[PDB]
Amino acid sequence: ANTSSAYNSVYDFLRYHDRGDGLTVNGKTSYSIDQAAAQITRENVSWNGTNVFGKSANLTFKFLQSVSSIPSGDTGFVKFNAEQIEQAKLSLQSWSDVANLTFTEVTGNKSANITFGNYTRDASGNLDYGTQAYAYYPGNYQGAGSSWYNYNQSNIRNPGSEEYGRQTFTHAIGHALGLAHPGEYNAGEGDPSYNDAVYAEDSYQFSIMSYWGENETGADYNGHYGGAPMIDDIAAIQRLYGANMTTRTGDSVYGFNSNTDRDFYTATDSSKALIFSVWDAGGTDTFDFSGYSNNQRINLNEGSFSDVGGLKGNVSIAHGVTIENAIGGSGNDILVGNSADNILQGGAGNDVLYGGAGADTLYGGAGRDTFVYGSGQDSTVAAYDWIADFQKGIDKIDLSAFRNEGQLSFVQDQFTGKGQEVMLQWDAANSITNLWLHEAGHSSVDFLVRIVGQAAQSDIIV
Ligand SMILES: [Ca+2]
Ligand SMILES: [Ca+2]
Ligand SMILES: [Ca+2]
Ligand SMILES: [Ca+2]
Ligand SMILES: [Ca+2]
Ligand SMILES: [Ca+2]
Ligand SMILES: [Ca+2]
Ligand SMILES: [Zn+2]
Numbered sequence: 001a002n003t004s005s006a007y008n009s010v011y012d013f014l015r016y017h018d019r020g021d022g023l024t025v026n027g028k029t030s031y032s033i034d035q036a037a038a039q040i041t042r043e044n045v046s047w048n049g050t051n052v053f054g055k056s057a058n059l060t061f062k063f064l065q066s067v068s069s070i071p072s073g074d075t076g077f078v079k080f081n082a083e084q085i086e087q088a089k090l091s092l093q094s095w096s097d098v099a100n101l102t103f104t105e106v107t108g109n110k111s112a113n114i115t116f117g118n119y120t121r122d123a124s125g126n127l128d129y130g131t132q133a134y135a136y137y138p139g140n141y142q143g144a145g146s147s148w149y150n151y152n153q154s155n156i157r158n159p160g161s162e163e164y165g166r167q168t169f170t171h172a173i174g175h176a177l178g179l180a181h182p183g184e185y186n187a188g189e190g191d192p193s194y195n196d197a198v199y200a201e202d203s204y205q206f207s208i209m210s211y212w213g214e215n216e217t218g219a220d221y222n223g224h225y226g227g228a229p230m231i232d233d234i235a236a237i238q239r240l241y242g243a244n245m246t247t248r249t250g251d252s253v254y255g256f257n258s259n260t261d262r263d264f265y266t267a268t269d270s271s272k273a274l275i276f277s278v279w280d281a282g283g284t285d286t287f288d289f290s291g292y293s294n295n296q297r298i299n300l301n302e303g304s305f306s307d308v309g310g311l312k313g314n315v316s317i318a319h320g321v322t323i324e325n326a327i328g329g330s331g332n333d334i335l336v337g338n339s340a341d342n343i344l345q346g347g348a349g350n351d352v353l354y355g356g357a358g359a360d361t362l363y364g365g366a367g368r369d370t371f372v373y374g375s376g377q378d379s380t381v382a383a384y385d386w387i388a389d390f391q392k393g394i395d396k397i398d399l400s401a402f403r404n405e406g407q408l409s410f411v412q413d414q415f416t417g418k419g420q421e422v423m424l425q426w427d428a429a430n431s432i433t434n435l436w437l438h439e440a441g442h443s444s445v446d447f448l449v450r451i452v453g454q455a456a457q458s459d460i461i462v
């Protein structure tokens with residue numbers, strides 16, 4: 001079963017960052033999304049009480065203007081500045097986007113579920129320029145839900161320009177909602193490291209509640225920080241409060257030309273980095289990564305990771321989400337669809353497109369592109385694929401995967417019945433080329449790929 005390098009690149013990319021199922025990664029136990037979610041919510045606490053799951057919540061938040069004391073003992077209180085307020089609201093929004101939560105600001109003497117405030121000194125009254133931030137779990141105790149940040153840190157004062165600040169806000173709010181660090185560790189306590197992680201997926205690539213960089217799991221964000229909930233965070237927060245099915249239910253576009261009105265899902269130009277795990281509750285959606293020149297690998301399968309804009313493992317799709325279309329850039333990309341009907345556009349460069357199950361429409365774009373098929377279920381007659389811009393003598397249709405059940409043979413105009421034969425039929429009236437494949441074990445011809453344009457036998461890889 002010697003398959004092509006194109007098929008192999010798809011086969012391997014589909015297994016990129018496989019997790020759970022008794023696997024061992026980095027010498028650690030591998031957790032599935034749900035296992036990581038249960039670990040992150042191990043304190044079993046939320047604003048609805050203890051051991052209460054799938055229950056929505058309407059919460060209040062406040063930017064403290066003064067304090068009688070900070071619950072931690074720290075001192076030198078400083079209220080949130082305008083930039084911190086705006087970024088904190090964006091962090092709150094990134095959480096309410098995915099879970100059934102509503103946030104309403106309160107002012108004056110009114111109490112609030114979640115509060116924000118800065119500190120600058122320790123209990124002894126000495127300047128603290130080393131710590132970052134901390135927050136308290138939901139509860140009925142003094143300080144529950146309060147979050148605090150070190151004003152002496154520039155990233156805390158300028159969260160809109162220093163990415164770690166925004167990520168810190170999202171992280172802290174996570175605690176204020178009931179989420180814990182993926183492992184038993186905290187700042188100030190000894191000096192933990194990724195080696196102390198309970199499971200392999202305890203890193204920024206999977207959870208912003210982690211303490212470890214995305215590099216620990218093989219990802220690379222080139223010095224950037226995502227700022228929004230990642231895949232395991234989304235599953236975790238939804239475990240506690242339920243999923244928000246009213247978010248972006250229309251046709252949504254992520255990346256370039258985005259209509260999300262969310263900075264973390266938007267790329268205004270090629271120099272912008274994208275780091276996100278998408279939550280989308282409906283409609284026909286598109287991953288538009290057309291503005292990059294880097295060779296990208298885009299996967300539309302729920303729960304999967306993609307390598308976008310030169311970064312590694314920076315984009316993922318949350319469990320329970322179906323993204324339909326993808327657009328690559330000028331680089332040599334790999335686009336992998338899911339079981340839904342996908343429209344894939346490779347763009348310039350030599351791309352590898354794989355529609356998977358469902359009736360997909362594929363555009364290789366300029367360049368020497370390869371349209372890959374891994375099984376007869378990829379393009380059944382009842383839901384056939386369309387390759388709309390095939391270039392005879394330039395593009396290729398890869399059927400090497402069918403070798404695992406016998407080498408495919410080319411027939412000119414008739415099937416013998418022996419099976420495992422491929423045929424190209426030209427429809428002069430419509431200028432359409434029908435690619436028929438009579439697969440072994442199939443009494444009837446059940447595989448068909450319709451091509452808008454001419455195709456030669458030498459363009460078909462068997
Ligand atoms: Ca949508
Ligand atoms: Ca969708
Ligand atoms: Ca491309
Ligand atoms: Ca598909
Ligand atoms: Ca192309
Ligand atoms: Ca092409
Ligand atoms: Ca298909
Ligand atoms: Zn923390």
